[PDB]
Every structure is written in C-alpha cells, then in structure tokens.
Design a protein around this ligand. Sequence first.
Ligand SMILES: CC(=O)N[C@H]1[C@@H](OP(=O)(O)OP(=O)(O)OC[C@H]2O[C@@H](n3ccc(=O)[nH]c3=O)[C@H](O)[C@@H]2O)O[C@H](CO)[C@@H](O)[C@@H]1O[C@H](C)C(=O)N[C@@H](C)C(=O)N[C@H](CCC(=O)O)C(=O)O
Length: 429
Amino acid sequence: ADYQGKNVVIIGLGLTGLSCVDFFLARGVTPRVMDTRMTPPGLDKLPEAVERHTGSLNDEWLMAADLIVASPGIALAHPSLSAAADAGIEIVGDIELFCREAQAPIVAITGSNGKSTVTTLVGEMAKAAGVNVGVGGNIGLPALMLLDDECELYVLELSSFQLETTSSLQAVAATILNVTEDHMDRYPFGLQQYRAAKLRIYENAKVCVVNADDALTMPIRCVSFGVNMGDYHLNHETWLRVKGEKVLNVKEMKLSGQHNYTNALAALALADAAGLPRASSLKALTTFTGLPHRFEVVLEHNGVRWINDSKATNVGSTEAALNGLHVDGTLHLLLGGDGKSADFSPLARYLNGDNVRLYCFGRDGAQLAALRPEVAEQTETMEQAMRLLAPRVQPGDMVLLSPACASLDQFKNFEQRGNEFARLAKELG
Ligand SMILES: CC(=O)N[C@H]1[C@@H](OP(=O)(O)OP(=O)(O)OC[C@H]2O[C@@H](n3ccc(=O)[nH]c3=O)[C@H](O)[C@@H]2O)O[C@H](CO)[C@@H](O)[C@@H]1O[C@H](C)C(=O)N[C@@H](C)C(=O)N[C@H](CCC(=O)O)C(=O)O
C-alpha cells in the first residue's frame, strides 16, 4: 500500500511496535505511538523524533488517525479501539502490513500447540533445499524485520491475536495445527471466538492443511494430516506416510512423541504445498533437535532428568508432555503462573498414582494444587517450589516444568521462566 501523508498511530511499544515505527519512518511517514503501560519496555529504543504517549490509550490520537496499527497485545475489543472501528478508522496489525509488502510465498502456521516446532521445521526444510527463507512472526522475530528482496519463502508463526487484525494474507499453504482452550482472557465469547480468529488463516490460502483428528481445525477441500487418518498419517516402530506410502521411519528423527510425529507430518504437508523437494524436506526432519524451553532436558545427573517445558503455557501443551510420559521413579511436576481463566481439569487424569508430586505456584497456584490436593504443595514462586522439591528428588525421578500457564504474572516471558528453572536445576541437581 501507499501510506504517504497518512496520520498513522501505532499501539504498542514492544517488539512489534518498534518494528512498525521503523517500517513507517523508512517510507517517509512519521507515526505516533502509544502504549497503556506506564513504562513500556521499548521506550528507550524509540527514536527521539517520534511522538509517544504512555500510561493509557490516547483517544485524541486514535480518533484523528487515518490508520491504526495495533500490536497483538491489545484487544480489538478495547473500548477506545472499538470506538475507532465504529468511526470507520482502518485498524491493521504488523502481519497485515507485512502481507501487503511481501514478494515471496508465505507459509502460515497457527494452533494452540506445536506451531513453533512446525514453523521451525518448515524453515529447516527450506534451508535444506537451498532456499533463501525468512522465518518469524509470533515465534519471536517481528515479520516486518524479515522483509528482504532476496527472500524466496517466508514462514510465519501466527497467533490468534495477529490473525484477528490480518485481512490480506494469501498463504501458499496454511494450517491450524489444533485448537484447545487458551487465551480465554482475550476471548469473552469463548472457544468458538478463539477458533474464529484462527480460521482466518485459511482465507485465500492456496492449500489449507487441517488436522484430521481435530475438527475445530477445519474450515467448513483441505489436505489433512493425522495419526490413523489423513493424507499424511502415521503407520505403526512408527512411520511417516503420505497416502499409504512410507516416507520416513521416525527412528531417523531426533524429536520423539506422537504429537511431534504429527508435527512432522504437518511440516511435510506445508513444505510439499510450498513446492519444496520432499527429499531435502525429509533430511531436515532427521537433523532438527528441537527448541529451547520445549520439553528440553537441561540437566541429567544422578539418575534424574530435569526438563524445561516452560513453553507449555496452556493445558493442551502440558497434556502433550504428560500423555504417555515414562518416569522410572516419581514425577515432580511444577505447575503455575497465570492460567488465563483455563479449566485445568483435563490434567487431572494424568495425576493419579503413588508416583506423582505437584508443586504449584504463581497467580493460579491454589487452583492447580486443587487438582489433587493430597499430593500437592503450593508456594508463591517457582524458586520456592524448586528448593522445596529438590531435597525430595531420588535417582530415577523426573523434575518437569510444564506449567500449563503464562509466565507473565511473575516473569518477563516463558524464556525467562525456563532460564531460571535451568539455573536452579543446575544448582540443586
Ligand atoms: C502479546 C503478544 O502477542 N506478543 C507478541 C508480540 O510481542 P510484542 O513485544 O510486540 O508484544 P506487545 O503487543 O507489545 O504486548 C506485550 C505485552 O504488553 C501488553 N500491552 C501491549 C500494548 C499496550 O498498549 N498495552 C499492554 O498492556 C500486552 O497485553 C502483552 O502482555 O510480537 C512478537 C513478534 O510477532 C511475538 O513474538 C510476541 O509473542 C509472544 C511470545 C506472546 O506473548 N504471544 C502471545 C500470543 C501470548 O499471549 N503468548 C503467551 C506467552 C506467555 C509467556 O511468555 O509466558 C501465552 O499466554 O501463551
């Protein structure tokens, strides 16, 4: 698009907002930027010339705007933003701005769990084929920072928040990996509203890739992946298959776990649709080792594995860690933080038996301990929980941080939570 001479207002002085400020300045447009936080993190990095407003949204600025660029961390339902929308003021996000500018095909990936793994895998598959690939989005690198005339393929992890404000995405291949309750603090019309945000990813996608085992991933035809069903499916040793043909024995993969094998199927389906050679795509599957904070063994010592799964910020993710988990002794499970109004009940079925202890902390600690009080301890912080469990740990035990919650009540982000866990594990283990 052409933004020359438009009154542009950006909401958010985080990573996204700073990238948008630069995007507009490079195009001869000086935006104004606001943030409801009194002392937002990006204040220091904001150029001196750019007007900024903190501590609230500025309605004088909003209602004067020709274009509002809303960071994914502000709800469109915010009264100030809904007022602007009612006035017919255009509201977009950074992913929208990116789509308007991108000059290479985009693979777009969302879902309640697995989306960083699949995004990274597709990136690895592209690299294995010698394709100049830009990987970013919700995974951490703001999409506008990917824009590159030499880029041949973009792979974007997209949150439901980012999808709400995106209207111009025409993916070469798009997927919703799964939909499980998350972000209910942002979705007062519940699961179907959350789902509706994710379903936007399929609009004008060349190929849609759905989860045959999760009907909420389906639009209302798509390529499918699944365990026993799907164009891409598993054949049990376990094999990855594409329509009945064996393509990879998963003993060649570094990743393990059935949910990671279906993640590999999703990645391969997207890579196939994007036109990458299957051979090099399969190669990438055999080399990829995983992501930080995603069921990451940070210490294995004295017959105990200490596993950082801080990236488990919802119940579905912690289920993926627990479902089929083999532990030789006792599982010491750390749960807690901001549960975002989730129902934690689905976890209860994994918490039976003589060999599970729960250490619950943060905002929703009490609600988590309530899953099975008789084997639960509640503390205020994760450090207190660690120092509590550590003396009790015996050879053969597992210590698992898979907290089923956001970290943001006590931590900067889930990476900080994971780093602190790994530090404490190395101290106490
Ligand atoms: C909230 C959000 O969507 N964050 C994504 C965003 O980062 P950013 O630095 O630009 O974020 P932001 O829009 O400034 O908001 C950051 C925080 O400031 C708050 N904020 C923001 C603007 C404002 O005016 N007022 C305000 O209070 C937001 O509510 C949020 O708590 O843009 C980056 C590049 O695209 C993303 O990598 C990053 O993803 C993260 C990891 C994330 O938080 N994503 C969302 C989907 C989310 O809620 N994830 C959490 C993680 C919790 C945790 O880390 O423990 C979760 O609940 O799963």
